[PDB]
Write a protein that binds this ligand. Sequence first.
Ligand code: HEM
Ligand code: HEM
Ligand code: HEM
Ligand code: HEM
Lengths: 141, 141, 145, 145
Amino acid sequence: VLSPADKTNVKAAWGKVGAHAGEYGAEALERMFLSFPTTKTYFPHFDLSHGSAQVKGHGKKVADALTNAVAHVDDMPNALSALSDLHAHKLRVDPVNFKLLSHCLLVTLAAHLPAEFTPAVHASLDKFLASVSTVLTSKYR
Amino acid sequence: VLSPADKTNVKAAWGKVGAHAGEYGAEALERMFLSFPTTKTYFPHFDLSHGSAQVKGHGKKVADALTNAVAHVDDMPNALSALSDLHAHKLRVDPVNFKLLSHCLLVTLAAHLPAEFTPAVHASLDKFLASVSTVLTSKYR
Amino acid sequence: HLTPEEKSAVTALWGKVNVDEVGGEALGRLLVVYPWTQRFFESFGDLSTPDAVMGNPKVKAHGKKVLGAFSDGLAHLDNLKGTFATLSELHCDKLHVDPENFRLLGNVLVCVLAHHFGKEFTPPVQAAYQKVVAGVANALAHKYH
Amino acid sequence: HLTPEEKSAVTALWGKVNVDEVGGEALGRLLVVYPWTQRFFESFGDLSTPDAVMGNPKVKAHGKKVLGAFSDGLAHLDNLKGTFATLSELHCDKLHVDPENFRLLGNVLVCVLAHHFGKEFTPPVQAAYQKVVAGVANALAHKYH
Ligand code: HEM
Ligand code: HEM
Ligand code: HEM
Ligand code: HEM
């Protein structure tokens, strides 16, 4: 579960992302596609070249959903309800890939938040992305 | 979540297991040790040869815990709370190993339940063991 | 690396497998147990309930084809990468199938063999089949890029 | 396998690494972020808080040891199995370290290199290091039995 301290750590670190969430979401996706190429099997309909409008747009959606989740961290299941439905019933992305994007979002944050990425914050952020991932795969079966 | 049909399926299948639960728990551990040899790193104090009484006694404990979980299927976190504490803070089994023992439990059940292991029952049992596994790793961090 | 006891155990059990029937059963169970896997089978008809998936003629037909290629790979256990290279490229470039699906099919196929064969699918026999399903999924994932 | 450019990028970034410093940081972060990995270090003293783990001299000392071996292994990117074979047998037979711990440490190492190098740890550089940390993990797990 996310402790109160975890929630405090996530709100502070993600709050610092602020206006860059679009950019960081896109970089995390590029990081994932390059490091873990099997994740590209879910985006054959996208131009995945560097800087593409589709990756930038999708990056913003992913980061705004995380903003929503940070903002409603005490009730993520209800706040991400439409997105858990979309992933479970339509996108149907294998659950193993959520750990891959989560790792890449964590690297992205580490690379852009030098002052804020302490060991404690790193653990809280890892736990939060895992909890978001659990909610997004909660209705798969 | 486990549905009403999943809970009925789990109780019917485990109910047929009946008094062979302990034998089947030891067989699932044996299946795990042979199939996934890295899981043997948690038992250096055990003779893991076929027929071992240490594996059989451990198998009975695992099976009795599963019986307890089936009995409290709507209140699993509290029924397994002491085992969650033990695995999180003493044994400290990496969470990836729970999916290996769950698959071996599933295989052991399939090999002993010709009539009951239908596709639906297989799916409910898989969900059940993943939910038990999730409760057992819930206090790890 | 399968041992010689392991290779013999795999071959001996495979002489009893009706590949067409087991393929149909394993693919149908994959679609029932991990239903998100139905994303690759949109044109296959009725997948609404377990019984509909299991009796679906297209599911049964594909299962036969899939396990037929798997069966053919059992004659080449020292060269699975080369045996499945063409199908790996196909699954990556044209079918866009995440290789985690090959791992899920491998586990369902082990469960089907255990259900069908019972006691004969012993711990050691299972261990030999786990090595084989892991090897085939790794071979089919090898040409992804 | 790493491409020639990927080998060059790994070598170039590693030339700027303080191995003792990064080792102590990565091992402490492993114990903080994945606390079940503390199971091997009950003789190490205080691991009661994040600050206590990071400041623990025995944790730092073990980090220096593990990453020093990692560092030396980067001269043998074409023979990681051979280079880590005896360490693989030791970690299995005597130390009983589940190889998943090697993957978790590789994930923490990537996060630490990202934190340390910032924008210099680009997506392509990360992709290269991911191959290296999966390669070392796989080499350290290869002699398990
Ligand atoms: C942190 C975990 C994730 C979050 C927060 C997330 C969020 C989102 C959002 C907000 C959308 C767009 C929904 C809309 O337009 O209404 C989306 C779509 C999508 N996601 Fe997820 N996602 C996550 C994980 C994943 C993973 C791991 C994959 C596959 C590797 C994935 C594949 C997709 C795809 C293919 C789409 C549709 C893209 C398009 O066609 O525009 N997602 N996701
Ligand atoms: C369905 C999942 C599991 C259940 C229900 C379960 C249950 C139990 C139980 C009931 C005990 C005995 C507790 C006591 O003596 O008070 C136990 C101990 C233990 N378990 Fe777990 N366990 C599970 C998964 C695992 C896995 C996946 C591993 C490692 C591969 C593991 C490793 C151990 C070890 C090493 C012990 C201590 C045995 C001894 O020294 O006697 N368990 N578990
Ligand atoms: C043992 C593992 C597998 C083997 C050996 C295998 C083999 C094959 C073969 C021989 C074909 C027909 C090729 C052709 O038309 O040229 C095929 C097609 C296909 N396979 Fe695989 N397969 C495997 C697993 C899977 C899994 C797990 C999935 C997804 C869950 C999958 C998805 C597909 C799809 C979507 C097609 C095309 C079906 C269509 O024609 O609509 N395969 N595979
Ligand atoms: C990059 C991955 C790793 C490398 C290259 C590595 C390397 C080494 C080396 C060189 C030694 C000393 C061997 C000897 O004394 O003969 C060692 C010992 C040890 N390693 Fe690993 N290690 C790695 C990861 C890990 C991890 C992740 C853990 C557990 C979390 C671990 C647990 C241990 C333990 C407990 C010892 C014994 C320490 C002592 O006796 O002071 N290692 N390792």
